[PDB]
Design an enzyme around this catalytic site. Structure first.
Site, PDB file in Angstrom:
ATOM      1  CB  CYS A   1     -15.732 -22.798   4.355  1.00  0.00           C
ATOM      2  SG  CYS A   1     -16.611 -21.746   3.313  1.00  0.00           S
TER       3      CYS A   1
ATOM      4  N   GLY B   1     -11.948 -17.947   4.718  1.00  0.00           N
ATOM      5  CA  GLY B   1     -11.309 -19.008   5.475  1.00  0.00           C
ATOM      6  C   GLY B   1     -12.135 -19.677   6.596  1.00  0.00           C
TER       7      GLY B   1
ATOM      8  CG  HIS C   1     -16.180 -25.062  -1.388  1.00  0.00           C
ATOM      9  ND1 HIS C   1     -17.151 -25.254  -0.286  1.00  0.00           N
ATOM     10  CD2 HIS C   1     -15.403 -24.266  -0.913  1.00  0.00           C
ATOM     11  CE1 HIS C   1     -16.804 -24.520   0.831  1.00  0.00           C
ATOM     12  NE2 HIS C   1     -15.677 -23.756   0.452  1.00  0.00           N
TER      13      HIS C   1
HETATM   14  C1  V2M Z   1     -15.629 -20.364   2.765  1.00  0.00           C
HETATM   15  O1  V2M Z   1     -14.525 -19.945   3.691  1.00  0.00           O
HETATM   16  C2  V2M Z   1     -14.790 -20.701   1.686  1.00  0.00           C
HETATM   17  O2  V2M Z   1     -14.078 -21.746   1.562  1.00  0.00           O
HETATM   18  C3  V2M Z   1     -16.368 -19.076   2.588  1.00  0.00           C
HETATM   19  C4  V2M Z   1     -17.001 -18.433   3.627  1.00  0.00           C
HETATM   20  C5  V2M Z   1     -16.981 -16.774   3.825  1.00  0.00           C
HETATM   21  C6  V2M Z   1     -16.269 -16.021   3.506  1.00  0.00           C
HETATM   22  C7  V2M Z   1     -16.358 -14.540   4.138  1.00  0.00           C
HETATM   23  N1  V2M Z   1     -17.203 -14.662   4.821  1.00  0.00           N
HETATM   24  C8  V2M Z   1     -17.781 -15.990   4.884  1.00  0.00           C
HETATM   25  O3  V2M Z   1     -18.924 -16.547   5.396  1.00  0.00           O
HETATM   26  N2  V2M Z   1     -17.067 -19.297   1.389  1.00  0.00           N
HETATM   27  C9  V2M Z   1     -17.253 -18.600   0.265  1.00  0.00           C
HETATM   28  O4  V2M Z   1     -16.517 -17.779  -0.035  1.00  0.00           O
HETATM   29  C10 V2M Z   1     -18.198 -19.202  -0.759  1.00  0.00           C
HETATM   30  C11 V2M Z   1     -17.678 -20.238  -1.528  1.00  0.00           C
HETATM   31  C12 V2M Z   1     -18.802 -21.206  -2.130  1.00  0.00           C
HETATM   32  C13 V2M Z   1     -19.373 -22.289  -0.937  1.00  0.00           C
HETATM   33  C14 V2M Z   1     -18.139 -22.108  -3.447  1.00  0.00           C
HETATM   34  N3  V2M Z   1     -18.794 -18.302  -1.434  1.00  0.00           N
HETATM   35  C15 V2M Z   1     -19.817 -17.353  -0.977  1.00  0.00           C
HETATM   36  O5  V2M Z   1     -20.170 -17.407   0.060  1.00  0.00           O
HETATM   37  C16 V2M Z   1     -20.238 -16.256  -1.767  1.00  0.00           C
HETATM   38  C17 V2M Z   1     -20.484 -16.258  -3.226  1.00  0.00           C
HETATM   39  C18 V2M Z   1     -20.724 -15.063  -3.658  1.00  0.00           C
HETATM   40  C19 V2M Z   1     -21.107 -14.210  -5.083  1.00  0.00           C
HETATM   41  O6  V2M Z   1     -20.731 -15.096  -6.098  1.00  0.00           O
HETATM   42  C20 V2M Z   1     -19.729 -14.243  -6.941  1.00  0.00           C
HETATM   43  C21 V2M Z   1     -21.891 -12.957  -5.023  1.00  0.00           C
HETATM   44  C22 V2M Z   1     -22.193 -12.241  -3.964  1.00  0.00           C
HETATM   45  C23 V2M Z   1     -21.907 -13.065  -2.432  1.00  0.00           C
HETATM   46  C24 V2M Z   1     -21.381 -14.326  -2.272  1.00  0.00           C
HETATM   47  N4  V2M Z   1     -21.033 -15.177  -1.380  1.00  0.00           N
END
Ligand code: V2M
Ligand code: V2M
Lengths: 303, 302
Positions: free
Chosen positions: B145, B143, B41
């Site tokens: 991921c 950040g 992603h």
């Molecule tokens: C990565 O850093 C993305 O690059 C990030 C992980 C975190 C951010 C804060 N704490 C973590 O562990 N990942 C995300 O933000 C992912 C992105 C996906 C893989 C495309 N999104 C989520 O983890 C996420 C989305 C949602 C949501 O929708 C709207 C509703 C409620 C919770 C939620 N978590």
């Protein structure tokens, strides 16, 4: 989000870990520049450790009496010296992986990462707190002496602990990198007891703020307390006194949650007098005191 | 002596963390040999993460759209491909710090070290346990991921986890290093729920073996049980059912203490049906389920 005990990455320290052997006694050493630091009792035999005259045993040793192994290579000892309980072995090769480093004596209540090592090989890493009675609740087995505790600020590694002893109660004791013990312990083969342990109050409060920032608010209450009245209850429950500096240190966490420090004190006071009643806080059934305000901020800022 | 949640030294993995940037989206990648692995992603735009068609999105991307940096040094991308939810970016430089490694898919209940990373810079290391519902209770911020979980056997690093997502409940989800999600989650900006969690039975039994090794053995009873009878009972108390592999990895601890696995299972069954009655095990009234049989041996043997 989330909150767990988390140590600084150990890579910069692993590259300094070596093995030191004298006779049939072996332990870990720390190799920075052209000097290897290790516990001095490596120069003892099984019989010497009962009551060792280190200055006596040290003058009777020669450089070639120390076998220093860095992985598979053997470093040549071209000198030795003693600084308190730490032996300093000068070597012909400087460690190319030596990071920017400093020796620091940590204050009680502060946390550091411990890199447990055996035979000069890193084995594991975990967070510890220098407890008020100057012990640490670690995980150390035979051969772990010489393992070091540390923190890392940017790229500078601050070394603060080198392991020496496990008390009869199962807790652990050691020195700073200048060879001075934390606590009233001595590097002789005897059963030694520590002073009465207290709970790190400022850390419990910080850890409660970590619970609120992670959605846990069940322990909060509408009551408030004065600093003195809280300290009276705290000392009764074997908690360290809370100073105004601690209140000041807790400011940022108070601003993020909107809960005044003295409000959290009333909440901790009630917890100490009423208990948690089977409930859990951040997964724990006990009040955790090994998270510093810094430790909490570094995982709960922005959440 | 002493029982701690202990993580493997992170140095061999620190030397493999890099930063991957596409447009303004930056996250962490894993640099092994001449390939960088990272969550796919990273190619998505802010508004694009709602329901991405990753296959079409990747068509519109070329090698020159990927900024891969070890520190501030750029690694030229010379090829790219997608494997499930992971992006593999071929680079022109083979990582000289590449350790001997392997990709493994762990089972629920097993533990691994997590090296929290931000902008390609490691920030912290802690030990996690993969819950039966395929979530880990970690500390991940924006950040994070691309951060990886791993184990180290001798000098071999077994990579088993790449971080992708935080759930509404605060726990985290991710993939193995082949891009296959643990559990029923998808890499998409949506609130997804994890299945109801359970207690990791095999780890509780390991914890009981640990107590026995330490002389704390009041809970050993005179009964035994069949594996099937225990499983049916354990499911009524929100405990995971045991597999043949679970019985097998308890072998070393069973032989060390002389307590057959099914005898310990019968001891656990009693504790589940009758509670502890104010008693403690290894200083606690709660049964602990985040140490594997290996972690117990490592901290009682060496
Ligand atoms: C990565 O850093 C993305 O690059 C990030 C992980 C975190 C951010 C804060 N704490 C973590 O562990 N990942 C995300 O933000 C992912 C992105 C996906 C893989 C495309 N999104 C989520 O983890 C996420 C989305 C949602 C949501 O929708 C709207 C509703 C409620 C919770 C939620 N978590
Ligand atoms: C070092 O590895 C020695 O090189 C070792 C540390 C541990 C051993 C088990 N768990 C550890 O952390 N340190 C020792 O063995 C020290 C030796 C120096 C001289 C201090 N000794 C002890 O830690 C020790 C001695 C005794 C004792 O006597 C008799 C009685 C009760 C407890 C005890 N601990």
């Amino acid at each position: 989000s989330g909150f767990r005990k988390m140590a600084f990455p150990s890579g910069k320290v692993e590259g300094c870990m070596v093995q030191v052997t004298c006779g049939t006694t072996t332990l870990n050493g720390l190799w920075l520049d052209d000097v290897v630091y290790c516990p001095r009792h490596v120069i003892c035999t099984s019989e010497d450790m009962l009551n060792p005259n280190y200055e006596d045993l040290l003058i009777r040793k020669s450089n070639h009496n120390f076998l220093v192994q860095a992985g598979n290579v053997q470093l040549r000892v071209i000198g030795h010296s003693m600084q308190n309980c730490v032996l300093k072995l000068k070597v012909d090769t400087a460690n190319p992986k030596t990071p920017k480093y400093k020796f620091v004596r940590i204050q009680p209540g502060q946390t550091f990462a411990v890199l447990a090592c055996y035979n000069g090989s890193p084995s594991g890493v975990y967070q510890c707190a220098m407890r008020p009675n100057f012990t640490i609740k670690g995980s150390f087995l035979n051969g772990s002496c010489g393992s070091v505790g540390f923190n890392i600020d940017y790229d500078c590694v601050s070394f603060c602990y080198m392991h020496h002893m496990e008390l009869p109660t199962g807790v652990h004791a050691g020195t700073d990198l200048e060879g001075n013990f934390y606590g009233p312990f001595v590097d002789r083969q005897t059963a030694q007891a520590a002073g009465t342990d207290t709970t790190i109050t400022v850390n419990v409060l910080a850890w409660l703020y970590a619970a609120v920032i992670n959605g846990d608010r069940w322990f909060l209450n509408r009551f408030t307390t004065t600093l003195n009245d809280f300290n009276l209850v705290a000392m009764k429950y074997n908690y360290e006194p809370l100073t105004q500096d601690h209140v000041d240190i807790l400011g940022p966490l108070s601003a993020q949650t909107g809960i005044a420090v003295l409000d959290m004190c009333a909440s901790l006071k009630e917890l100490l007098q009423n208990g948690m009643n089977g409930r859990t806080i951040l997964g724990s059934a006990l009040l955790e005191d090994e998270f510093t305000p810094f430790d909490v901020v570094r995982q709960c800022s922005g959440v």
